[PDB]
C-alpha cells in the first residue's frame, strides 16, 4: 500500500509545481486511490521492502502528490488523476528530462491495465527556463512579410526519387504559383539517388529566381534530420549561408535533445525551425493508451519550433474537433482557460513566450479550405501535395488555384459571412476568375 | 489547356481584380471591428523589394470612422499616383500586421 | 502627473513579479503618491508630453506597479515604497 | 596617531606620482592632519599594531602621501586633502586598478564622517600606458564626415515592448529626418519580448535604407551590455559584420574590466563606441559623499571610448554649469590648467591622447538648442528622445526640426551673434522656413 | 497635416534654401577668423558618397582676402557648373574640417 504517503486527499498544488493529468485503468476491483498513488510513486519513488538511504534525503519534500482523482465522463473504470511535481524533480529547460521523468518507467507497472498521460501544467517557471522558440509567429510574420491570410504550403511529390536539379525545378514550379513555402518530405535527407548537397543548392537557386520573379520573400524547408548532430548543424549552417530562411526537422525521430539543439543554432543564427510529427501517430493513434497529442505539443513548444503539423480534423473524419481546436489554442495563445471539452484541465499561461505555427496537411484540398480557414484561424499552414501537384494543368496552376481560393475564402471571411455553408457560392465566384480554380472544384467535387 | 503566366503580384489580393469601393469599406470596416488601427503605406513600384514602405500620416489610434480612412486613401493617392499604395492594420497587442493588402496601384 | 496611471490603491503583485522598495524623499511639500509613481514610471516609462509610438505597443501591461506607500518608521518625509 | 609617517608638511609631489584630491569630514574635534593621514593610509596601507612582515619591503617608499589641506569654500569641517601615489602602486593601464586601490577600503573607516573623491590626478605614464579611446573626436568625425555642427541623436521611445520590425522602422523614421544616430535604451539589450538578433538585424536594415535615402553616412547605437563577456564580444561582432559602424555599452553596470575589453575589441576592430552613464547618480547625486562624475569620466576617457552622458546642466537645473564645462574640457582638451571654480585641482595634460565626445540627453527639447551649443561647443552630441518622438507631426518631423534648429543655431554663431539673448529671433526665423519647427516651438513655449 | 518628403540634401545647410553671396562672404570671414585655410571641393552629384572629392588649386595658406576667395569660388563654379561645388576650412593644429558646406548645386 502506497496511499498513505502518496495519495494527497486535500492538498492544493503549489503554483511552482508540475501538474499532470493521468486517464488511468488499473486492474478489476482495485482501489483507484491506491492506483493512483502507485502511478504517482512510479513517477518519482519505488521500493520493494524497507530501505535506508532514503532516510538521507527527505523523501517527503522530493516526491509526487496525486491530489485529485475525477470520474472519466464515459468509463467508470477509467478515472482521471491529477499528480503534483515539486519544481526541483527536474532540468531547467530540459524538456527530455521531464519526458524521462514523467514517463521513463511508469507505463512497466504490472498494476495498471491501462495508461495515458493527457495533460501537463508547466510552471511559469520552467517555462521561462527553456530556450522556447527561436523566432516565434509574429517574428515569423515580420520576416516573411506575410499577414492577412493564412500561409500556404505543398509537399514535394513524389516522395523521392528526384535529383537534384528536378527536385529544384520541381519546388520552383511550385513556388512560382503564389505558395508561400514548400517541405521536404520527412523520410528524405540523403539518399543514393540525391545527396542532400545537391538538394539544397539547387533548392537554393530556384527559391531565390522563384523569389525575383513573383517579387516576393519565399522559402522552402529545408530537412537537416541525419545521422549525427555533427551532420545536421553542418548542414543547417550550409543552409545559412546559401540565404535560405528556413529549415525543417522531424523532433521526435531525431530526438528532443536534438530538437532543443537545433532550435538554439536556428537562434543564434537567426534560422526559421519546421518541425514536423512523424511518428506521432505511434504514441497517440491509439484513443486510450500512450500520450495524447496535447502533451508532445507542449513539449514541442518549450523545447523550441515555429510550425507543428496537425492534420486539420477534417477531409477524412469529421471527429472531435473540439479537443483538436484546444491543442490549437495551447499553441497559439499565451494563456487558455480550462476546458473538459478540449481537453484543458488546466490553467495554463505561457507568460509572454511566443507561440508556434500551426500545419495542416493530408487529405486535403480545394474543396476544404473555407472550414479550415474557419477552424484553423490565421495563425496556420496549408500544404496540398498531391492537390497542387496533381491538378492537371501543373503545379504552378494548381498552387495558384489554391492562393486564389484562400485570398477569395480569408476576404469573404473579413467581410463577415458564415463561410461554411455558402462555401459553394464562394469557390464559384472565386473561379469567376481563375479557371484553374474551376476545374479543381471540378475535380473533385 | 493554356498557361498561367508569371505576374508581378501585390501580396494578398494581388492575383484578384482590384477591390471596389465599396469592399474597401468593407475592408476597413472590418480592421475596426478588429480593434486594429490604419495606416497608410506608398513607395515606388521599382523598390517594391524593400521592407519598409514611405508612411502616410501617423496611424490614427481611436479612429472608428470609414470616410476619413476613404477620403485619406484618395489624398494621399493623388499626391502619389505613380506608386503602389497599401492599408494596413496594426494591432497594438500582438506587433503585426492584422491584415494588409494594396489598394491602389501605380501607373 | 503620473498617478492616475503609475499609482495602484488596490493592486495586489503578481507572484512572477519583481518587487522593489525604495526608501524615498521627495522633494518638501509634494504628493508622495506622485513622487512614488514618478519613481515606477522613470523605471521603465517617461514622456514629457503627449507620444505616439507608445499606442502600438500595450503600455499598460508592460509598466511597473507601485502598490504600497508606508511610513518609515524615524522619518515622516522618507518613505517606503513598493513597486512592481 | 599616522600624521608622524602619512603627514607630508613639506613633500612636493613628483611627476610621475598619482595625486587625489578627497573632501573629508572627519569626526568632530579630530585633528584634520591625521583624519588626512589615516585616508591616506587606509588607500595604501593599515596596521592595528606592530608588524614584522613590514620591514621586508621598504614601506617608506611604497607609501602614499597626503601633503596639502586646503579649507573648502563653505565648510570649515570640510577641507580638501591632496594624497599622492607613487606610480607603482597600480597596473599599467587597469582603471579597475586605480579604482581599487582608491576607493577599495576608504571608505569604511569610522573616523571619517563622509569622503568625497573630487579630482585626480594621471600621469603622463599612465595615460600613455592605458588603451585609451579606439577612435578619438576627430577620427569619428573622419568616419562619419560630419563637421561644422554638433550631432543629433534621440533614445527609441517607449523604454520597451518594441519588436524588431518596430524597433527598426521606428529607428528608420527617427534617422530619415537627418538625426545623426539614434541610442538604445540603457536597460534594453535582450529581452522575452524581443531578442538582440532580431533588433540588430532590423535596425541593421533600416539604417542601410535610410543611408541609402538621405545621402549621408548614418549608423544607430547597439548595445551589447550583457550577462557574459562571450555574449558581449558575439554581439559586437555579429554588429561588426552587419556593417554598422557603432554599439553602445553600460560602463559601470557592465563593469570597467567590460569596457575595457569592449574597447579593445573595438580598437582592433575598428569600430566606434558610444557609453551611457547608467547608475552615475548613485555614485554623484549626494553633493557632499560619494565620488565626483568628473573621475568617473576621466576613468572612462583612460579606459576607451568616444561619448559619454552628461546631460547639459539646463533645462530644469540652472545650477553650477561652471563644474560641468569643467569636465567638458577634461572630456575633449589634451590639457587643461587649474581651476576651482571649475572643479579642475591639478595641471592635467593628456598628451596626444584623443578626447572623448559629450552626449547631452535628458529634459531637453527645442526650445534650450541655443544654450546647449552655446555651453558644449561643437564637440558633442544632442539627444531628443520623447520631443522627437512626441512631435505631432511624426518622429521624422521632429528631427527634422530639431536639426534644422541646430543648423540656424550653428549658423548664427558662426555669424558672430550672441545667441542666448535672441534666441528667439533665431528660431522665429528658422520657423519662417520650416513650419515643423514653428509648430514644435510652440508646443514646448 | 501634411507630409515632408525625403530630400537629397547635401551636409550642414543642405536643408536651407541656397546661401546668397554676402552668407558666403561671412562664412569665409568666420573661416579666416578661425585662423583655418579655405579649400575647394567640386565632384559629379552622382558620386556624392565618395569619400574624397576633386579638390581645386592647393589650400591657401596665409590667405586673409575674401575677394580671392570669391574669385576662386565663381572660376571652379564655371570650371564644372554641373558637379557639386561645396567650401571647408581646413584646421591644421586639429587635422579635422572646422566647418564645410555646399556652395553650388549642379544641374
Given at each position: 500500500?502506497?496511499?498513505?504517503?502518496?495519495?494527497?486527499?486535500?492538498?492544493?498544488?503549489?503554483?511552482?509545481?508540475?501538474?499532470?493529468?493521468?486517464?488511468?485503468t488499473?486492474?478489476?476491483?482495485?482501489?483507484?486511490?491506491?492506483?493512483?498513488?502507485?502511478?504517482?510513486?512510479?513517477?518519482?519513488?519505488?521500493?520493494?521492502?524497507?530501505?535506508?538511504?532514503?532516510?538521507?534525503?527527505?523523501?517527503?519534500?522530493?516526491?509526487?502528490?496525486?491530489?485529485?482523482?475525477?470520474?472519466?465522463?464515459?468509463?467508470?473504470?477509467?478515472?482521471?488523476?491529477?499528480?503534483?511535481?515539486?519544481?526541483?524533480?527536474?532540468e531547467?529547460?530540459?524538456?527530455?528530462?521531464?519526458?524521462?521523468?514523467?514517463?521513463?518507467?511508469?507505463?512497466?507497472?504490472?498494476?495498471?491495465?491501462?495508461?495515458?498521460?493527457e495533460?501537463?501544467?508547466?510552471?511559469?517557471?520552467f517555462?521561462?527556463?527553456?530556450?522556447?522558440?527561436?523566432?516565434?509567429?509574429?517574428?515569423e510574420?515580420d520576416?516573411?512579410?506575410?499577414?492577412?491570410?493564412?500561409?500556404?504550403?505543398?509537399?514535394?511529390?513524389?516522395?523521392?526519387?528526384?535529383?537534384?536539379?528536378?527536385?529544384?525545378?520541381?519546388?520552383?514550379?511550385?513556388?512560382?504559383?503564389?505558395?508561400?513555402?514548400?517541405?521536404?518530405?520527412?523520410?528524405?535527407?540523403?539518399?543514393?539517388?540525391?545527396?542532400?548537397?545537391?538538394?539544397?543548392?539547387?533548392?537554393?537557386?530556384a527559391?531565390?529566381?522563384?523569389?525575383?520573379?513573383?517579387?516576393?520573400?519565399?522559402?522552402?524547408?529545408?530537412?537537416?534530420?541525419?545521422?549525427?548532430?555533427?551532420?545536421?548543424?553542418?548542414?543547417?549552417?550550409?543552409?545559412?549561408?546559401?540565404?535560405?530562411?528556413?529549415?525543417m526537422?522531424?523532433?521526435?525521430?531525431?530526438?528532443?535533445?536534438a530538437?532543443?539543439?537545433?532550435?538554439?543554432?536556428?537562434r543564434?543564427?537567426g534560422?526559421?525551425?519546421?518541425?514536423?510529427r512523424?511518428?506521432?501517430?505511434?504514441?497517440?493513434?491509439h484513443?486510450?493508451?500512450?500520450?495524447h497529442?496535447?502533451?508532445?505539443?507542449?513539449?514541442?513548444?518549450?523545447?523550441?519550433?515555429?510550425?507543428?503539423?496537425?492534420?486539420?480534423?477534417?477531409?477524412?473524419?469529421?471527429?472531435?474537433?473540439?479537443?483538436?481546436?484546444?491543442?490549437?489554442?495551447?499553441?497559439?495563445?499565451?494563456?487558455?482557460?480550462?476546458?473538459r471539452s478540449?481537453?484543458?484541465?488546466?490553467?495554463?499561461?505561457?507568460?509572454?513566450?511566443?507561440?508556434?505555427?500551426a500545419?495542416?496537411?493530408?487529405?486535403?484540398?480545394?474543396?476544404?479550405?473555407?472550414?479550415?480557414?474557419?477552424?484553423?484561424?490565421?495563425?496556420?499552414?496549408?500544404?496540398?501535395?498531391?492537390?497542387?501537384?496533381?491538378?492537371?494543368?501543373?503545379?504552378?496552376?494548381?498552387?495558384?488555384?489554391?492562393?486564389?481560393?484562400?485570398?477569395?475564402?480569408?476576404?469573404?471571411?473579413?467581410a463577415?459571412?458564415?463561410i461554411?455553408?455558402?462555401?459553394?457560392?464562394?469557390?464559384?465566384?472565386?473561379?469567376?476568375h481563375?479557371?484553374?480554380?474551376?476545374?479543381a472544384?471540378?475535380?473533385?467535387? | 489547356?493554356?498557361?498561367?503566366?508569371?505576374?508581378?503580384?501585390?501580396?494578398?489580393?494581388?492575383?484578384?481584380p482590384?477591390?471596389?469601393?465599396?469592399?474597401?469599406?468593407?475592408?476597413?470596416?472590418?480592421?475596426?471591428?478588429?480593434?486594429?488601427?490604419?495606416?497608410?503605406?506608398?513607395?515606388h513600384?521599382?523598390?517594391?523589394?524593400?521592407?519598409?514602405?514611405?508612411?502616410?500620416?501617423?496611424?490614427?489610434?481611436?479612429?472608428?470612422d470609414?470616410?476619413?480612412?476613404?477620403?485619406?486613401?484618395?489624398?494621399?493617392?493623388?499626391?502619389?499616383?505613380?506608386?503602389?499604395?497599401?492599408?494596413?492594420?496594426?494591432?497594438?497587442?500582438?506587433?503585426?500586421?492584422?491584415?494588409?493588402?494594396?489598394?491602389?496601384?501605380?501607373?
Open positions: 500500500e502506497y496511499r498513505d504517503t502518496y495519495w494527497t486527499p486535500d492538498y492544493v498544488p503549489l503554483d511552482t509545481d508540475l501538474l499532470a493529468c493521468f486517464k488511468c488499473g486492474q478489476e476491483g482495485v482501489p483507484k486511490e491506491e492506483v493512483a498513488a502507485a502511478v504517482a510513486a512510479e513517477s518519482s519513488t519505488g521500493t520493494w521492502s524497507t530501505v535506508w538511504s532514503e532516510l538521507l534525503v527527505d523523501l517527503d519534500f522530493y516526491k509526487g502528490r496525486c491530489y485529485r482523482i475525477e470520474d472519466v465522463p464515459g468509463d467508470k473504470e477509467a478515472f482521471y488523476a491529477f499528480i503534483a511535481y515539486p519544481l526541483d524533480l527536474f531547467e529547460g530540459s524538456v527530455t528530462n521531464v519526458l524521462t521523468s514523467l514517463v521513463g518507467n511508469v507505463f512497466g507497472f504490472k498494476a495498471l491495465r491501462h495508461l495515458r498521460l495533460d501537463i501544467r508547466f510552471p511559469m517557471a517555462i521561462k527556463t527553456c530556450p522556447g522558440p527561436p523566432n516565434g509567429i509574429c517574428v510574420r520576416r516573411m512579410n506575410k499577414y492577412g491570410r493564412p500561409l500556404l504550403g505543398c509537399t514535394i511529390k513524389p516522395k523521392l526519387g528526384l535529383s537534384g536539379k528536378n527536385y529544384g525545378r520541381v519546388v520552383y514550379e511550385c513556388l512560382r504559383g503564389g505558395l508561400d513555402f514548400t517541405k521536404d518530405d520527412e523520410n528524405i535527407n540523403s539518399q543514393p539517388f540525391q545527396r542532400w548537397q545537391n538538394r539544397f543548392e539547387f533548392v537554393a537557386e527559391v531565390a529566381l522563384a523569389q525575383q520573379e513573383t517579387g516576393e520573400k519565399k522559402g522552402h524547408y529545408l530537412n537537416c534530420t541525419a545521422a549525427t548532430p555533427e551532420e545536421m548543424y553542418e548542414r543547417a549552417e550550409f543552409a545559412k549561408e546559401l540565404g535560405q530562411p528556413i529549415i526537422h522531424d523532433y521526435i525521430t531525431g530526438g528532443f535533445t530538437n532543443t539543439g537545433l532550435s538554439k543554432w536556428c543564434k543564427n534560422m526559421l525551425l519546421h518541425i514536423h512523424a511518428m506521432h501517430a505511434v504514441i497517440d493513434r484513443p486510450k493508451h500512450g500520450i497529442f496535447r502533451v508532445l505539443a507542449k513539449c514541442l513548444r518549450l523545447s523550441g519550433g515555429d510550425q507543428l503539423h496537425t492534420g486539420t480534423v477534417v477531409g477524412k473524419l469529421e471527429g472531435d474537433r473540439q479537443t483538436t481546436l484546444g491543442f490549437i489554442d495551447q499553441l497559439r495563445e499565451s494563456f487558455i482557460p480550462e476546458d478540449r481537453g484543458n484541465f488546466f490553467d495554463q499561461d505561457w507568460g509572454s513566450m511566443p507561440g508556434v505555427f500545419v495542416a496537411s493530408g487529405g486535403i484540398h480545394v474543396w476544404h479550405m473555407p472550414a479550415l480557414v474557419a477552424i484553423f484561424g490565421d495563425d496556420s499552414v496549408l500544404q496540398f501535395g498531391g492537390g497542387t501537384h496533381g491538378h492537371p494543368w501543373g503545379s504552378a496552376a494548381g498552387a495558384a488555384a489554391n492562393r486564389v481560393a484562400l485570398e477569395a475564402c480569408v476576404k469573404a471571411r473579413n463577415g459571412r458564415e461554411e455553408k455558402e462555401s459553394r457560392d464562394i469557390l464559384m465566384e472565386a473561379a469567376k481563375s479557371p484553374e480554380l474551376a476545374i472544384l471540378e475535380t473533385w467535387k | 489547356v493554356g498557361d498561367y503566366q508569371t505576374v508581378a503580384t501585390l501580396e494578398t489580393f494581388g492575383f484578384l482590384p477591390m471596389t469601393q465599396d469592399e474597401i469599406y468593407d475592408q476597413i470596416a472590418y480592421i475596426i471591428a478588429q480593434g486594429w488601427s490604419p495606416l497608410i503605406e506608398h513607395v513600384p521599382s523598390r517594391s523589394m524593400a521592407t519598409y514602405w514611405s508612411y502616410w500620416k501617423l496611424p490614427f489610434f481611436g479612429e472608428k470609414l470616410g476619413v480612412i476613404v477620403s485619406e486613401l484618395e489624398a494621399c493617392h493623388r499626391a502619389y499616383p505613380d506608386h503602389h499604395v497599401r492599408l494596413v492594420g496594426y494591432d497594438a497587442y500582438t506587433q503585426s500586421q492584422g491584415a494588409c493588402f494594396v489598394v491602389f496601384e501605380g501607373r
